[PDB]
Design a protein around this ligand. Sequence first.
Ligand SMILES: [Ca+2]
Ligand SMILES: [Ca+2]
Ligand SMILES: [Ca+2]
Lengths: 514, 516, 504
Amino acid sequence: QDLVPAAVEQAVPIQPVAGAALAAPAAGQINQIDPWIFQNFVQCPLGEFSISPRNTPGEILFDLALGPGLNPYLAHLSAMYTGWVGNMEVQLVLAGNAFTAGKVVVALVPPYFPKGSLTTAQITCFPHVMCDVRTLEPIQLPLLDVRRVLWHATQDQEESMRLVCMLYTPLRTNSPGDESFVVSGRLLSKPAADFNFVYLTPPIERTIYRMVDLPVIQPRLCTHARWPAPVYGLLVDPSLPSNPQWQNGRVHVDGTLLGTTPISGSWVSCFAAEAAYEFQSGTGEVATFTLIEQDGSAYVPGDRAAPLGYPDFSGQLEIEIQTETTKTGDKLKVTTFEMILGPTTNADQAPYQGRVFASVTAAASLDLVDGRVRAVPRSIYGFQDTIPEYNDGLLVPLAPPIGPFLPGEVLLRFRTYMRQIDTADAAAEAIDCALPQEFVSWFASNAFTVQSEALLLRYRNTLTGQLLFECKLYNEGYIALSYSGSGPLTFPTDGIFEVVSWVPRLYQLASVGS
Amino acid sequence: EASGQDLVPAAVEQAVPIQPVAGAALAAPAAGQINQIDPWIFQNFVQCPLGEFSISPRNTPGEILFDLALGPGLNPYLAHLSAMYTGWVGNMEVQLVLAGNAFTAGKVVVALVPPYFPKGSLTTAQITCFPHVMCDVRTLEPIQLPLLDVRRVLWHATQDQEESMRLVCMLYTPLRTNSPGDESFVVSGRLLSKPAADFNFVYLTPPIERTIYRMVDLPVIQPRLCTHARWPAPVYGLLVDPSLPSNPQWQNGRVHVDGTLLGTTPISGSWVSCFAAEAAYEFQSGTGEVATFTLIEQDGSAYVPGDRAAPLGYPDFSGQLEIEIQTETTKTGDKLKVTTFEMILGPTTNADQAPYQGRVFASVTAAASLDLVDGRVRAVPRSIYGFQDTIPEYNDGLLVPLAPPIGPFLPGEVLLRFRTYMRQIDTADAAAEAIDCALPQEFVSWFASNAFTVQSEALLLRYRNTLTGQLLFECKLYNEGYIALSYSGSGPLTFPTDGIFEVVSWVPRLYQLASV
Amino acid sequence: EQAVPIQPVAGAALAAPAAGQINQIDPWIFQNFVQCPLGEFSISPRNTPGEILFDLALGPGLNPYLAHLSAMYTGWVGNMEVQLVLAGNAFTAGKVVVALVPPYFPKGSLTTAQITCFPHVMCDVRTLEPIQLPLLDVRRVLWHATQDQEESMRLVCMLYTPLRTNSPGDESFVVSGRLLSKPAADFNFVYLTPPIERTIYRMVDLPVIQPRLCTHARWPAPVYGLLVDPSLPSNPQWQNGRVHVDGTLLGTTPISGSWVSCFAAEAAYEFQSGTGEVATFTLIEQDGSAYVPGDRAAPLGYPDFSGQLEIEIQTETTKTGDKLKVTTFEMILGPTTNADQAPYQGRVFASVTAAASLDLVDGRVRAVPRSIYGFQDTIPEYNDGLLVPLAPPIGPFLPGEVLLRFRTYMRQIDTADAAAEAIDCALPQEFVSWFASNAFTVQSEALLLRYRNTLTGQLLFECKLYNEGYIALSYSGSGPLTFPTDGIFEVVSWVPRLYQLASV
Ligand SMILES: [Ca+2]
Ligand SMILES: [Ca+2]
Ligand SMILES: [Ca+2]
């Protein structure tokens, strides 16, 4: 009587969701967009992901949220509106082989479903599409505005429908292996027929859904963020410790300054304090410094280990100060003082409590008048890359170690050389930073929104266009490279970084090496 | 229909000052699916999960008898169905049953409290400022009330709780009886509910068992087949005794109904009254061989003094405890042995012992210095001498964080005890030494591994006999983790250990239990 | 009214299906334009274009009657009508812009170019009639909650084109502007609830007590006078007598007046072979509690001045000539060190000038002040030479504003001159307790106050009470000026920080 076909094309059944019909009576305006934005799939700002045989079933490959942050045109247009309503459509492409086996599921997760941990059995209880990694053509899905409000505010994030993809079946290759074959995936989107904005406002450039960019300066023309010297090298080195705990040069991508890093590069490794001088018997002058901020304000013990720009390493410091004497026939001079920074004893060093001690040998009194001084670094002796004596021997608030790199990932280092006093070894002492200056700035000056876990960057030659490597910039302000060698590897410093897209935490980078 | 109607019958007085409220019709254009509830569910009144309450002549006006929040948690069908959705809307119908004796008198008020009204002290002056209904306790027919969805959103979320209309009942007039003989009656009221015409759910989601509503359940196991939570022995007795101290401060076997462990109670029953440590041995011409133990966690982790008086599973009583220890010796002929040590738990001794700092001392009498190598060991109990059921010293007389004493109880309520017997050394008395606990270890593991969500204040339990299927008594299980029942006798009372406990409903603290 | 590019907004028609009740308001309220709070400004020839003249948010708090009525309801909905009045003659020039800013626009600084991109109106200062505007309820919900502050439409007025005028030689010309409002025909309340007294639309008030019957917050003595003296330091850093208007205690101030300049501690007495007996105190809370160092310099009520004082404690002797006694100790607070006083860590030292052993027992004591020697108005030594967390100095003040001080006199030991002592405070202890127990809601930056005589009802002066808990007066003199201690302080209204007081 009836025939049931064995092969049916996949589709997602939906019930239509009302947009501006529900929002019109309570909104001030209903603003329509260009009719040709409805005709083209354009790559999402988060539009890159990867699949590897290192992955396991149940891992989330990506998750996207409905809103004007999925389309470059809509993200550009959102700067002159206060709200939005409507549905969208998403397209997915995978670059697979004929030798690869594997299945993924793309599901539609409603708002207010708890965001804990889904499993492979649960993911198929949502409206979904099952996709093979060998597909040649793109796959598309809808995104409806299931909501309890009349419309959404642009300037916040709120809660909306999500699009989550997880690895349903493990990725296998018939080849003996193991290789390092990676399947690339890209995402595109476009609004559906029932999308518009709410209220026409002036265009504000410093809005959310504004893409992050970087200053166009080569690394040679930059300033080191931990020692006052120009940047001289760019390298990766797996023989060095992997998770340092530097306190300077640390900034969040969204603009938060972590640790004791300042805004300007003239505050690095310097300090400002009120000085009092004394003489003991023959040891010379002893200077006690009560520390303040470099702009003249007062220092209060808080969530930082020291005033902004305080040195975060160990050794003996030779510094310069400006002094005035009460002697006859001699006005202001510049004096050199000796300082102890490393974890030691026989002194009471507590910059966390605003007390510092310095000294200089002298057979006379050479009395000086107390006042405000600014101390800058001149020379270093016995340098060690470890935190200083912030308190006497106690614990103070600190920025966390860098971490938590994926397997095979190493840290990119910007390298400069210090002025060092040595007797036997003539080698130049070297110090490293994660991000240079003018990168600490351009953050906290632009208040960006992260919208994802990492940023993909490409390093390129200026006048040739050759690609040197690609890297991941995490939201915590450090760069990772995929390198598996044993020795140091350096790179030319006349390149330019450029932003590609937002990528998730599990993204797999193309390997680098010699 | 009934015999002498010298009562109130129907409380058809409402004309409640409220407008009709729209339900699922406002949420249909904002949902991406079509959902509906089984039409037969809309056709009968079933008892709410919090559908039992009591009025006693010991309550005062202004006490809250029940308060119910609108949502899927008032109906067993709807609470089962809410595990596979994210969203609900609509109104409800509620039936209140309270038909006390004809010799009684009293009055209650049931009010409709809107969302966003602050919770806390609700006095008898304000409850009449709401849309309300006045009820006699002698009313024969059930009283029917509506619960409307007053809201400013289109629907609510099943997981996590939001602000909705409440239904609050407060005792307005004290309950008194007119009978000549010796007693005053108690009124037992019931609540039933069903959805209204426009109730619905929103979006189908995977069915997850560990949802917020669910229902608390207990393991199906007889008390005689369980293990004691304070001494490594089987449970032998189920008892109530009003001559023993009423508010003990035991540190082991304490667990919250939501799953939190309080005190020094371990997950496993093999950690009870045992400890793992690093042992260093020395010879003293007095006590003989002296062993110093620095205590660590039983799984091997480091011990850090924190918000607990001792490492998990440490003994919480007093006396002289004798234990067995595995030891290695360098004397030719013997390699491994089990040695018996003894140590004073309490009498507070000279100065000493500081379990809160991980220091323990023990000794064994001997003449020649036995060659013993320092190492890692685990000690388990063997015997007790001069047992006293009082907390020991942990900080050498200084205060330590402790679990609160068990309580409080309503007047006439006593604590139920699970009893076992310990191996004892005695010189002139041959009577067995007994030790009690509040819950067995199986219940502790069940609560720790299940992590339910509590609703009001306590659970009503009924104890049934497996052989004859006859209910023995009813008790209140408090959310803090103890059990109370009403008993007014003088001597101890014991119960058979062949029964099974069962959950009935959620009850508040002022629930009045029947005597036993 | 004027035409603006905006659509009509529905009120109760959208809230009625899901509301319980829709409640009506007195029809006489719809017939009166009442002054809005923070709805006045003045324009001077020296102002530059781009200054924000006002910005007010839609809600019940714009009208005193609706603010009163909101206490017996759960929600509200609807639009309002607004009137703007400007006072200038025919010989002026300049222009102003009033815009409609939507509920979720980011807060910040607007430029004169961006204000014209909203729905707006342009007005000349020569306008005769008041300018009428609508205030519409643009929202993503069905109604609002009375006890919660949500986002609503705002009305923002900026100076667009500067004022050009002539002025006489004695006074400078200004253009004054005021804003009034009333509900529109589509405004309603939601649900009849029992009235609440601790609502958010509650105005700040002060206790009706004369300052001569009050208590000093820094020294346990009655207040003997109030004054203003520009010669004294402008920005003191007192750690006592500091309270926020919303009710947050700052520094080390206690709630009770009996905790001022007193401390409780566990005492250990040991006889030194030199000067005499020495007592070491481990500080605790006055009511009895563990003291933990934190964001606070010293336990509540600890003295915040420098000098040498004497204390009296209850001591018990194990000898047989007595059992209980009260003796006077001696401790040093000023920045002279020599004993390593660390109140921040919770330990201090004291000594007595006595010979031989003076056996006592350690059973906890409370120390009260007796007299001060070498008093100095500087913070004591909390750490040996280190820094501690403490409250910022009092300020800032506008150009021409001075601090008003409540003065009291303390005992002394000085042997050279016997004129008087002097210790000042910002607010008395009664005001501190009032603000702590009331917990009001602050609106903008400051409150306008008035000092009047109780009987004749004459005005003495007017001042400004800042949110941080200090009073400022507009005084242009040189020497100190004292005031009678018989008046009563009264609250007038909320004022902005840049408010010009009348000179005293
Ligand atoms: Ca060297
Ligand atoms: Ca015995
Ligand atoms: Ca004097």
